[PDB]
Amino acid sequence: TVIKNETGTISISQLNKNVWVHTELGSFNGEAVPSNGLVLNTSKGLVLVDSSWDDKLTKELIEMVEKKFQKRVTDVIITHAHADRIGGIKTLKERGIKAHSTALTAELAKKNGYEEPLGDLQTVTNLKFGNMKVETFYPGKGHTEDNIVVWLPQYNILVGGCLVKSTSAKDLGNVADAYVNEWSTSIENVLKRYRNINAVVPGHGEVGDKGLLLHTLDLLK
C-alpha cells in the first residue's frame, strides 16, 4: 500500500496497520536524494520519526498525513542535527509539534543556527504515544557524533536513520561529520541490543532487515 502526493515528491508506504514509511525527494549538494522516516498512527495522534529536508517538504508531509489519517501530528523524533534531518524544525515549533532529540542534537542544532528541539532524550529513552511504544537509543558516534536509532518493540522495527545504509548504497555517502572507526562499534552496539529485528528502515533506500547493519559494517572496512 503506497500513496504519493500531488507532485510525486512525497510517498508513504504501509509496513503494518499503524506504521508507515515516509519518503521525500529532497536535495543534497545539488543532487536529488530520497530520504526515509516513519509515520506512527497512534490512538492519540501521529508521531513522526524524522520530519523532512526543509520547511516546505515538512509542511507537505504533515498536511498529507493529517488529512489521510484524520489526526494531528503531535510529536517528531529527530535523529541527528544535520540540515537533512533538522531542516523543518521552524515548521514544527510554530505549529506546536513537540520535537524530541538528545541534548547533544539540540546543542548541535543551535550551534548550526537552527531552532532547538527539546533535548529530552537520554542514551535510552522509552516513550509511549497512545498505545504505541517507542524506544530511542544512542549507540555511539557514526554518520555524525549525535545519531540515534529508534525501536518499535511491539513490531521489532528498527529505524536506523543515516547510521544504516541500504543494500543499494555502495559507499558511505556524506562523511564530513562522520566517525568511521566508532561507526562499526556503534552498529555492533545496535546489533547487540536488538537481536531479533523484523525490519530495518535505513536513512535512504529500501527497507531491509539486519542484513543492512551487516552491509554497513562491510562498507566501513
Specify whether 215 is catalytic: no
Point out the annotated binding site: 80, 82, 84, 143, 162, 165, 174, 204
Catalytic residue among 22, 100, 143, 215: 143
Domain boundaries, the chain: 1-221
Dist. CA 48–CA 70, nearest whole Å: 15
Q: What grid cell was written down for 20?
A: 508507515
Degrees (nearest 5) of the Cα angle 49, 57, 31? 100
Closest among 189, 50, 36 to 124, alpha carbons compared: 189
Which is it for strands 2-4 and 98-100: parallel, antiparallel or unpaired? unpaired
Catalytic residue among 82, 100, 146, 215: 82
Dist. CA 194–CA 22, nearest whole Å: 23
CA 150 to chain centre: 8
**Identity at 41, one-letter amino acid code:** N
How was this entry determined? X-ray
Q: Resolution of the deposited coordinates, in angstroms? A: 1.4
Point out the annotated binding site for Zn(2+): 80, 82, 84, 143, 162, 204
Q: Taking a C-beta distance cutoff of 8 angstroms, is the pair 116, 106 a contact? A: yes
Specify whether 84 is catalytic: yes
Specify whether 198 is catalytic: no
Superfamily of domain 1-221: Ribonuclease Z/Hydroxyacylglutathione hydrolase-like (3.60.15.10)
Specify whether 82 is catalytic: yes
Q: Strand order of the sheet with strand 199-202?
A: 124-129, 132-137, 149-152, 157-161, 199-202
Catalytic residue among 41, 50, 75, 80: 80
What 60-65 contacts at long range (C-beta under 8 Å, 24+ apart), as own/partner pairs, is 60/5, 60/9, 60/10, 60/24, 61/10, 61/22, 61/24, 62/91, 62/95, 62/97, 64/5, 64/10, 64/12, 65/12, 65/22, 65/39
Specify whether 80 is catalytic: yes
Which is it for strands 19-28 and 157-161: parallel, antiparallel or unpaired? unpaired
